[PDB]
Amino acid sequence: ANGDPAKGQLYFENEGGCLACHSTGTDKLVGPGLAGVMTTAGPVYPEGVNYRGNLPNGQPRTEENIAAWIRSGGQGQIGVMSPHEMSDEDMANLLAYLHTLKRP
Numbered sequence: 251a252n253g254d255p256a257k258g259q260l261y262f263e264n265e266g267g268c269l270a271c272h273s274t275g276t277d278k279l280v281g282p283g284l285a286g287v288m289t290t291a292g293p294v295y296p297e298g299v300n301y302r303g304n305l306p307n308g309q310p311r312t313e314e315n316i317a318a319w320i321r322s323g324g325q326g327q328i329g330v331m332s333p334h335e336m337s338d339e340d341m342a343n344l345l346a347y348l349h350t351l352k353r354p
């Protein structure tokens with residue numbers, strides 16, 4: 251919505267620390283690559299991991315549930331997320347930058 255992908259990228263690289271665990275493409279550092287994470291197809295998971303088209307916590311793939319997962323974190327078959335509480339404008343910018351990540 252009212253998100254800034256430049257501020258979103260700055261939060262992704264510094265104030266959020268997401269790049270140190272997540273790749274902007276389809277590679278896997280600690281978690282899955284967030285390429286296409288904001289689309290209905292989801293990101294690229296390693297072979298064997300499957301959440302049945304939903305988030306690792308069980309909720310479907312929507313902006314609200316993805317934001318709630320990011321703020322809450324959790325553990326799935328791959329690794330462990332950390333809780334990243336953030337303001338609403340920062341979350342909007344972060345979701346915008348995640349939208350900028352396209353999965354081929």
Ligand code: HEC
Binds near residue numbers: 269272280282324328
């Ligand atoms: C290392 C501690 C990480 C940090 C820093 C960030 N993420 Fe994370 N993320 C990590 C793991 C190990 C996983 C997979 C969990 C599992 O085992 O199932 C994830 C997952 C996500 C997801 C969901 C992916 C999906 O397929 O639905 C999202 C949307 C996500 N991560 C986003 C995200 C953001 C916005 C971060 C900065 C606040 C961030 N991650 C940091 C590990 C780590």
